[PDB]
Amino acid sequence: VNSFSGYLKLTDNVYIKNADIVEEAKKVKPTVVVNAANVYLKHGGGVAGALNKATNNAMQVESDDYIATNGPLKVGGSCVLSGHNLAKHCLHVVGPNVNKGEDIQLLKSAYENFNQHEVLLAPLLSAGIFGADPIHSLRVCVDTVRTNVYLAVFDKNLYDKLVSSFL
Numbered sequence: 001v002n003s004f005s006g007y008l009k010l011t012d013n014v015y016i017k018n019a020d021i022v023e024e025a026k027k028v029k030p031t032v033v034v035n036a037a038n039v040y041l042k043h044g045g046g047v048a049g050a051l052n053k054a055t056n057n058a059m060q061v062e063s064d065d066y067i068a069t070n071g072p073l074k075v076g077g078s079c080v081l082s083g084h085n086l087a088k089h090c091l092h093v094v095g096p097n098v099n100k101g102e103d104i105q106l107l108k109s110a111y112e113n114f115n116q117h118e119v120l121l122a123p124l125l126s127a128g129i130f131g132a133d134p135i136h137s138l139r140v141c142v143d144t145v146r147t148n149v150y151l152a153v154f155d156k157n158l159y160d161k162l163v164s165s166f167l
């Protein structure tokens with residue numbers, strides 16, 4: 001038993017809700033919140049910009065030190081950093097950005113990072129400003145992640161579409 005509430009159960013291990021991941025994060029204090037990061041950890045907009053704003057830019061300050069030491073992530077890759085006031089940890093995961101021409105097959109590799117964590121609060125990778133089809137992203141999530149994932153979907157309309165079309 002964990003503290004996530006109001007989720008719809010899609011599979012043995014995948015759950016979905018219409019929620020603002022920032023507000024869900026501040027209420028659950030999950031062990032892991034996933035950020036929809038880019039390779040430079042430049043948290044300017046989308047989920048990343050919202051999450052970073054909620055940390056009063058501390059996420060960005062920590063991320064800039066990470067990049068200065070380690071260089072950029074790979075598309076499909078991840079790193080674990082602090083969750084600041086939102087979670088114990090933030091798993092920054094880079095899905096392919098269709099608006100940059102990145103290969104959508106990397107979406108599976110991106111979701112594989114979730115399997116290193118027993119429970120996660122996450123957005124749909126490569127959705128939103130990353131330009132992928134959120135229904136495809138949900139399918140890849142369900143077919144790739146084996147750990148317990150709680151998907152927060154900001155847009156109510158999108159959600160109702162994700163649920164109603166889920167096979």
Ligand SMILES: O=C(O)[C@H]1[C@@H]2CN(c3ncnc4[nH]c5cc(F)ccc5c34)CC[C@@H]21
Nearest residue numbers: 021045046047050123127128129130152154
């Ligand atoms: O590509 C993106 O950046 C994310 C678009 C929407 N994404 C979100 N998904 C769950 N919770 C969310 N809260 C937000 C608050 C915001 F100001 C902005 C976005 C989000 C958001 C994920 C898919 C894609």
